[PDB]
Amino acid sequence: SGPVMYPDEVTSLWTVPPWNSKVTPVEKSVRNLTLNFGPQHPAAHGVLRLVL
Amino acid sequence: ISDGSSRPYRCKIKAPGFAHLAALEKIGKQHMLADVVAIIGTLDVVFGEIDR
Amino acid sequence: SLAVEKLLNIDVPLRAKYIRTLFAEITRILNHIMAVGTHALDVGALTPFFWL
Amino acid sequence: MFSIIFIALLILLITTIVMFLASILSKKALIDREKSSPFECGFDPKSSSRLPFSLRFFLITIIFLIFDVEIALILPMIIIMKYSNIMIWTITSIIFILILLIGLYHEWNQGMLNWSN
Amino acid sequence: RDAFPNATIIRPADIYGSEDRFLRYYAHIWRRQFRSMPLWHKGEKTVKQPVYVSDVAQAIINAAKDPDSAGRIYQAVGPKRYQLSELVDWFHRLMRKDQKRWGYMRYDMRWDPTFLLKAKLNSFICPGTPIGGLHPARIEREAVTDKVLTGVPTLEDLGVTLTTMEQQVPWELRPYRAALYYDAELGEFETPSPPKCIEARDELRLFA
Amino acid sequence: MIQLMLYSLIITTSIIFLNMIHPLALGLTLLIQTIFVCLLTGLMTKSFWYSYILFLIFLGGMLVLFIYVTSLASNEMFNLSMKLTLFSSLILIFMLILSFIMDKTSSSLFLMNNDMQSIINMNSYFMENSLSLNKLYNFPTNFITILLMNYLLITLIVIVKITKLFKGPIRMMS
Amino acid sequence: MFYMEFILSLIGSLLLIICVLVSVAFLTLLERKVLGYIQIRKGPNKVGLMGIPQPFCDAIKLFTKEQTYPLLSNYLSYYISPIFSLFLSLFVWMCMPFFVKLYSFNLGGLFFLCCTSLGVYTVMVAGWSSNSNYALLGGLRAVAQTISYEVSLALILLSFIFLIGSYNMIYFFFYQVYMWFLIILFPMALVWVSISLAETNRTPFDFAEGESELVSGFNVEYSSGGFALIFMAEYASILFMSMLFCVIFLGCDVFNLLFYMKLTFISFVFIWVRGTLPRFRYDKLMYLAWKCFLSFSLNYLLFFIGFKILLFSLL
Ligand SMILES: COC1=C(OC)C(=O)C(C/C=C(\C)CC/C=C(\C)CC/C=C(\C)CC/C=C(\C)CC/C=C(/C)CC/C=C(\C)CC/C=C(\C)CC/C=C(\C)CC/C=C(\C)CCC=C(C)C)=C(C)C1=O
Ligand SMILES: CCCCCCCCCCCCCCCCCC(=O)OC[C@H](COP(=O)(O)OCCN)OC(=O)CCCCCCCCCCCCCCCCC
Ligand SMILES: CCCCCCCCCC(=O)OC[C@H](COP(=O)(O)OCCC(C)C)OC(=O)CCCCCCC
Ligand SMILES: CCCCCCCCCCCC
Numbered sequence: 001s002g003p004v005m006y007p008d009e010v011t012s013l014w015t016v017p018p019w020n021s022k023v024t025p026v027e028k029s030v031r032n033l034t035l036n037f038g039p040q041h042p043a044a045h046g047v048l049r050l051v052l
Numbered sequence: 053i054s055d056g057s058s059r060p061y062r063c064k065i066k067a068p069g070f071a072h073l074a075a076l077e078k079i080g081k082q083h084m085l086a087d088v089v090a091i092i093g094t095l096d097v098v099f100g101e102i103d104r
Numbered sequence: 105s106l107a108v109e110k111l112l113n114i115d116v117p118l119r120a121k122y123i124r125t126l127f128a129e130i131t132r133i134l135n136h137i138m139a140v141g142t143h144a145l146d147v148g149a150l151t152p153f154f155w156l
Numbered sequence: 157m158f159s160i161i162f163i164a165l166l167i168l169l170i171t172t173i174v175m176f177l178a179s180i181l182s183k184k185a186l187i188d189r190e191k192s193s194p195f196e197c198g199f200d201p202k203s204s205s206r207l208p209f210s211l212r213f214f215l216i217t218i219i220f221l222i223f224d225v226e227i228a229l230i231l232p233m234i235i236i237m238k239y240s241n242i243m244i245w246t247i248t249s250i251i252f253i254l255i256l257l258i259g260l261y262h263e264w265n266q267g268m269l270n271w272s273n
Numbered sequence: 274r275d276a277f278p279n280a281t282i283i284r285p286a287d288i289y290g291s292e293d294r295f296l297r298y299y300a301h302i303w304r305r306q307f308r309s310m311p312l313w314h315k316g317e318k319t320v321k322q323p324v325y326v327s328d329v330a331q332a333i334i335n336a337a338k339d340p341d342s343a344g345r346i347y348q349a350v351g352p353k354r355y356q357l358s359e360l361v362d363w364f365h366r367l368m369r370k371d372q373k374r375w376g377y378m379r380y381d382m383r384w385d386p387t388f389l390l391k392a393k394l395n396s397f398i399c400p401g402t403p404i405g406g407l408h409p410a411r412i413e414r415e416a417v418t419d420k421v422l423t424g425v426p427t428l429e430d431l432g433v434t435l436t437t438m439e440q441q442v443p444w445e446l447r448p449y450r451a452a453l454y455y456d457a458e459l460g461e462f463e464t465p466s467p468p469k470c471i472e473a474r475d476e477l478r479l480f481a
Numbered sequence: 482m483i484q485l486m487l488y489s490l491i492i493t494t495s496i497i498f499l500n501m502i503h504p505l506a507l508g509l510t511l512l513i514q515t516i517f518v519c520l521l522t523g524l525m526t527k528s529f530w531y532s533y534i535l536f537l538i539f540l541g542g543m544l545v546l547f548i549y550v551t552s553l554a555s556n557e558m559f560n561l562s563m564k565l566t567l568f569s570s571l572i573l574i575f576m577l578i579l580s581f582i583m584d585k586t587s588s589s590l591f592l593m594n595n596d597m598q599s600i601i602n603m604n605s606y607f608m609e610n611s612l613s614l615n616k617l618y619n620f621p622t623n624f625i626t627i628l629l630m631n632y633l634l635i636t637l638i639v640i641v642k643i644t645k646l647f648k649g650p651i652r653m654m655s
Numbered sequence: 656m657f658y659m660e661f662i663l664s665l666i667g668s669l670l671l672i673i674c675v676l677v678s679v680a681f682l683t684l685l686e687r688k689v690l691g692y693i694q695i696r697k698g699p700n701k702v703g704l705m706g707i708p709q710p711f712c713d714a715i716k717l718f719t720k721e722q723t724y725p726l727l728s729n730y731l732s733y734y735i736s737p738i739f740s741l742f743l744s745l746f747v748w749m750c751m752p753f754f755v756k757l758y759s760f761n762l763g764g765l766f767f768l769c770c771t772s773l774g775v776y777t778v779m780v781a782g783w784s785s786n787s788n789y790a791l792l793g794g795l796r797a798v799a800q801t802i803s804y805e806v807s808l809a810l811i812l813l814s815f816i817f818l819i820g821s822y823n824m825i826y827f828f829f830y831q832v833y834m835w836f837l838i839i840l841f842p843m844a845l846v847w848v849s850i851s852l853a854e855t856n857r858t859p860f861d862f863a864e865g866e867s868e869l870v871s872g873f874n875v876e877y878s879s880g881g882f883a884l885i886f887m888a889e890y891a892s893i894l895f896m897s898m899l900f901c902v903i904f905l906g907c908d909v910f911n912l913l914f915y916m917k918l919t920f921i922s923f924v925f926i927w928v929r930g931t932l933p934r935f936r937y938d939k940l941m942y943l944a945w946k947c948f949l950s951f952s953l954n955y956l957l958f959f960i961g962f963k964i965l966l967f968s969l970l
């Protein structure tokens with residue numbers, strides 16, 4: 001029932017692989033790029049700061 | 053609104069572009085950056101009346 | 105002026121009404137030319153900006 | 157090709173002399189703390205531009221690489237028409253362009269030429 | 274002092290600030306040679322007491338407002354004394370230019386005949402200010418040791434407080450930091466240790 | 482003389498390429514490597530076709546690889562080392578000296594150029610890339626070209642299958 | 656090889672480089688004058704006599720203003736990229752078909768494609784090394800632009816080559832002795848004009864240097880010489896594709912002044928498209944150069960394959 005037949009010192013800290021062969025990837029948090037259309041931008045009409 | 057004196061007690065200016073820039077968050081979402089630039093123009097919004 | 109005239113319960117004459125209407129639509133053309141030129145610069149058309 | 161090497165080195169030399177002459181004759185003012193900062197439309201950046209960038213056209217780039225090495229096999233047959241069997245040349249050329257049209261129209265049908273989104 | 278009989282003479286040491294010559298001289302490319310730092314006697318035998326520029330300016334303000342400061346000489350030094358090797362090592366620790374990653378090393382300038390010829394060429398071929406403030410007068414200005422005279426009042430007599438380098442120079446060497454392109458996290462770069470300050474007995478043991 | 486110079490430059494850029502941790506240093510090093518390799522390959526053939534083809538190939542490939550640099554390992558520190566600069570400079574000046582003091586007839590390539598071929602060769606008087614590229618479209622090996630068209634179509638099908646476009650864009654920590 | 660050749664090749668190449676650089680300056684003057692006259696307003700008129708030394712005003716100022724030493728940038732890669740941009744934009748001009756033997760470019764189309772691919776490499780290196788978000792966005796827009804137009808530019812070139820039978824552009828002169836190729840290749844006169852604006856990063860495809868979508872594109876951190884060499888590199892690319900429109904579609908003769916009048920006219924067309932049409936999105940550029948231009952190029956390549964087999968049997 002171990003990960004291997006004969007657990008060594010390094011090997012015995014492992015866990016059993018899942019009986020289902022499929023391991024779904026986890027959903028990790030993503031930090032997107034913070035770009036501001038600041039005031040100097042001509043599309044921002046002079047005094048608008050869009051923190052996109 | 054006036055208290056009967058020579059000066060107005062309080063004058064509030066309803067910006068036409070205030071609600072447009074408020075709904076910019078939903079209108080401009082899931083679009084391109086160039087699509088955001090055109091949308092900002094489509095709402096007409098000089099920020100003197102918005103900022104008051 | 106309509107706010108202060110509604111508070112003062114006074115009425116404007118017909119000539120002042122037509123002057124206000126005429127210059128309000130002249131003012132409308134000016135805002136739209138501003139909107140068309142601003143949207144043309146934001147989209148990329150350099151020419152109708154100057155042409156209007 | 158040996159002359160092209162020498163004239164490419166001369167153009168590189170002339171452009172480096174032009175850039176060094178632009179640097180020497182430039183106005184030498186003292187460097188301010190916030191002069192050197194990245195622009196970011198007049199405000200603080202909140203993030204470096206070395207932050208990872210999202211790629212929505214990865215399939216289009218690899219299809220571009222595949223189509224470019226497909227370009228590398230079309231360029232011979234300008235010369236090969238006058239010196240080969242006409243039947244074999246036409247079977248290869250029309251079959252090449254029709255296979256490219258099948259592949260491009262099939263990926264247009266699947267919508268794989270649209271950006272991921 | 275002969276011509277104007279009551280003049281508030283202020284004697285400053287090397288002055289550190291923004292747009293200065295002291296930090297900008299060490300931070301410049303033309304002073305170092307192939308990512309190595311040449312210093313006189315490896316910086317060990319030169320002891321300096323630098324002063325911050327707003328301290329000197331506020332001393333000038335307090336000397337202008339006080340009429341009792343006329344006809345006096347005021348020493349303008351910082352609160353603590355350092356030697357030049359510890360100062361340069363602390364500057365390159367603040368600049369994220371360590372021994373291993375950047376290749377910064379300190380060697381004696383007296384065995385280097387290239388650097389003096391480079392300084393003379395930089396003073397000769399420049400029509401205006403030399404590049405990086407590199408000239409033999411700057412070499413003699415950094416070579417001399419900052420010595421105060423007893424009985425001559427310091428800036429504490431003028432009522433101004435003194436700014437330690439540990440309050441300003443970590444901010445002041447922020448644009449001169451190496452590898453500013455790297456989007457570092459909080460624990461990526463360790464805050465360097467403050468430099469050691471030389472005492473009186475260590476200074477008399479060093480100068481003996 | 483130019484061939485030995487290209488030998489020395491390729492050796493020095495290969496030493497530089499073996500020592501660079503950062504992907505953009507590898508990209509610029511293999512840019513100058515494919516420039517020098519394209520010139521050297523040209524020296525061997527009568528015509529200059531395959532150098533041009535290899536340059537379009539290796540500029541169409543790393544154009545994509547920079548987008549993957551900016552999407553994955555965009556933030557990584559450059560580390561200049563004085564030892565590598567001194568080693569590359571000393572080896573480069575040593576090989577230019579060794580190439581200058583060398584007999585260039587012995588070090589030249591034995592592969593025949595367009596002018597190294599004799600006058601009696603009537604096949605040399607044709608258009609310069611005709612008989613070299615002929616067998617792509619001739620009868621014995623057109624079927625290999627057919628196999629390459631089908632192989633590129635199967636390659637594109639594989640790329641579409643294992644890059645699922647509907648799973649979203651790719652970045653670090655997606 | 657005779658010694659005098661090398662000397663005259665060097666002299667002609669250097670004279671060509673100098674004349675292309677001064678023609679870049681007067682091309683900026685031509686764009687600033689007719690592009691004003693695209694609208695109602697005038698061009699530069701006050702400075703000098705009638706605005707003729709105005710590029711000299713623009714060149715004296717940019718060679719004297721303070722060089723930017725940016726903070727977060729890689730300066731050792733930021734300083735070198737406009738030099739290489741101008742180097743390839745002047746190095747591509749050695750491909751010009753001279754009736755004298757300037758250079759015996761038997762593979763001029765492949766040389767043009769190599770320098771075309773390398774110029775956008777200098778653009779995308781200059782975009783990354785500025786360490787600004789708008790500069791990286793302009794650089795990635797330039798990479799998406801060249802990935803859009805590269806295979807379309809190659810296949811369209813092959814169709815013209817088929818009408819020639821060789822890769823030497825002086826053979827364009829012998830096949831255009833009776834008429835120009837604008838009669839046959841009018842849909843790719845439109846398509847090659849579309850590609851040549853995407854090659855030179857010009858309006859309607861101006862995503863690498865955007866003034867409204869981005870702030871100056873990848874030129875946001877470049878000033879006083881870096882911007883100057885980037886700008887001359889772009890305008891020398893404009894002059895080169897105006898020349899290539901005159902070579903392929905019009906008469907390839909170079910001993911007539913009508914050729915250079917036509918080159919000035921195609922440069923005026925390059926200014927004229929910028930002053931009329933709005934900019935695209937590069938989403939629509941990628942959907943255009945992959946589904947319309949590439950399909951039309953493959954289809955009309957099939958048409959030219961069949962026409963060249965039909966013509967070869969008749970000869
Ligand atoms: C409604 O809400 C809004 C607001 O609120 C009210 C706002 O406020 C705003 C903000 C708006 C404003 C404040 C004003 C509105 C803005 C505009 C109207 C801008 C739009 C107009 C333009 C962009 C101009 C039109 C474009 C033109 C004319 C194109 C050309 C422009 C240039 C800049 C090109 C000039 C650059 C040059 C020439 C570079 C110089 C380089 C050279 C000359 C190099 C050449 C060298 C040579 C010739 C010689 C060299 C030779 C050499 C080296 C070798 C010689 C050697 C020898 C030996 C001889 C907005 C948008 C808004 O919506
Ligand atoms: C295909 C890919 C190929 C890739 C490989 C290409 C390799 C090319 C060769 C590379 C050589 C690199 C040498 C680098 C030396 C300078 C290093 C450096 O970084 O210098 C910094 C200096 C100022 O920059 P700094 O203050 O550090 O600001 C950055 C802060 N973030 O920066 C500067 O001062 C800017 C540089 C100025 C240089 C001036 C040189 C002196 C003048 C020379 C003579 C000019 C003569 C002109 C007139 C001639 C007339 C005939
Ligand atoms: C700094 C180099 C920038 C990159 C240049 C790329 C050129 C095209 C690629 C190539 O291999 O072209 C083969 C061509 C082969 O020449 P061609 O076949 O074009 O012409 C024959 C040549 C005298 C008949 C026309 O060579 C070059 O373009 C020379 C490049 C010189 C590089 C100098 C620096 C090392
Ligand atoms: C590029 C080589 C620069 C060498 C600079 C001097 C190094 C001296 C080392 C003395 C022993 C630590």
Ligand SMILES: CCCCCCCCCCCC
Nearest residue numbers: 306307380384385386387388
């Ligand atoms: C440009 C080279 C400078 C070298 C400086 C270090 C010299 C070390 C050896 C000194 C022997 C007296």
